[PDB]
Write an enzyme that holds these catalytic residues in place. Structure first.
Site, short mmCIF file in Angstrom:
data_model
loop_
_atom_site.label_atom_id
_atom_site.label_comp_id
_atom_site.label_asym_id
_atom_site.label_seq_id
_atom_site.Cartn_x
_atom_site.Cartn_y
_atom_site.Cartn_z
N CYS A 1 4.21 -4.99 10.96
CA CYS A 1 4.60 -3.70 10.61
C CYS A 1 4.58 -2.84 11.76
O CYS A 1 2.95 -3.09 12.35
CB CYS A 1 3.70 -3.29 9.52
SG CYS A 1 4.54 -3.98 7.92
N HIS B 1 4.27 2.84 8.08
CA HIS B 1 3.29 3.34 6.62
C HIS B 1 2.32 3.61 7.29
O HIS B 1 1.73 3.69 8.14
CB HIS B 1 3.68 2.04 5.82
CG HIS B 1 3.24 1.12 6.56
ND1 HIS B 1 1.11 1.19 6.52
CD2 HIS B 1 2.93 -0.10 7.30
CE1 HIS B 1 0.61 -0.14 6.81
NE2 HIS B 1 1.92 -0.98 7.19
N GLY C 1 41.24 -16.81 -6.61
CA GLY C 1 41.29 -16.98 -7.40
C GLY C 1 40.19 -15.77 -8.36
O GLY C 1 39.37 -16.06 -9.46
#
EC number: 2.3.2.-
Length: 262
Positions: free
Chosen positions: A209, A191, A91
């Site tokens: 990183c 970065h 539904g």
């Protein structure tokens, strides 16, 4: 038809965007989709030059489509999400139709090799940049694999609690960085890291990183776009999960193709 109870679809990339060769089409719904087969049926993707592709779900509310190989530069892609009032199971129905048109730019693949500690950026097969890098140290290593470039930030704070690691704990951090390009939902960025320039090119010191120098991070931030590729090889880490959010290319074709509609 918009350009990019009831569920709204949201489609990426955005209308007229130029993306890199690893960019998947993403369709994300604001409700869990009980009938994935139906969602898939309602989505029509056209490519020029034509290329085969297939759907794979990363979770219950988000489906992805990509070819077998990276896109060919110049390809034009149209995505028609014809879900308005479609039966999506239990539904729930589509709130609306949505569409987008985007193009694939240059092939940009950056490879970080733990054997050399160099991140080498290749544009259409030409080495244009070689960046000494310092990746995840052995106790918090960078996962191997293919990462898709996501968003970019001139300055942000990376906070480890976002990923379930308290700032106070031995692997924790709350760190201001410049020129931050995100490459996984699990928290990996390329970065600026002025605090590991002596190490970059020699020793892994990060939490995962890809540390590079201030001017290499800025260069990367200036020249890379969403959909470009960072391939990490040879670390002592695992493999980035295929359902990261930007890990899609780690799922082998045969498994992707078969899909997971049920």
């Amino acid at each position: 038809t918009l350009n990019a109870h009831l569920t709204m679809p949201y489609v990426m990339p955005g209308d007229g965007e130029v993306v890199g060769v690893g960019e998947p089409v993403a369709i994300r719904f604001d409700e869990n989709i009980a009938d994935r087969g139906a969602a898939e049926k309602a989505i029509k993707i056209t490519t020029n030059p034509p290329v085969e592709g297939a759907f794979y779900w990363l979770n219950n509310r988000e489906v992805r489509w990509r070819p077998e190989h990276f896109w060919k530069p110049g390809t034009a892609v149209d995505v028609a999400v014809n879900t308005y009032g479609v039966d999506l199971g239990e539904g729930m129905f589509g709130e609306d139709n949505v569409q987008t048109h985007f193009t694939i730019g240059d092939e940009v693949i950056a490879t970080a090799d733990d054997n050399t500690k160099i991140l080498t950026v290749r544009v259409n097969g030409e080495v244009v940049k070689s960046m000494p890098t310092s990746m995840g140290k052995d106790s918090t290593p960078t996962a191997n694999g293919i990462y898709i470039v996501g968003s970019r930030y001139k300055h942000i704070i990376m906070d480890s609690s976002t990923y379930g690691v308290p700032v106070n704990s031995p692997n924790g951090y709350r760190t201001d960085v410049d020129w931050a390009t995100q490459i996984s939902y699990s928290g990996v960025f390329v970065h600026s890291a002025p605090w590991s320039v002596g190490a970059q090119g020699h020793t892994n010191t990060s939490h995962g990183c890809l540390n590079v120098s201030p001017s290499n991070a800025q260069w990367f931030y200036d020249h890379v776009k969403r959909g470009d590729i960072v391939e990490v090889v040879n670390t002592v880490g695992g493999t980035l999960p295929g359902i990261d959010g930007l890990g899609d290319w780690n799922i082998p074709w045969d498994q992707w193709r078969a899909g997971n509609a049920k």
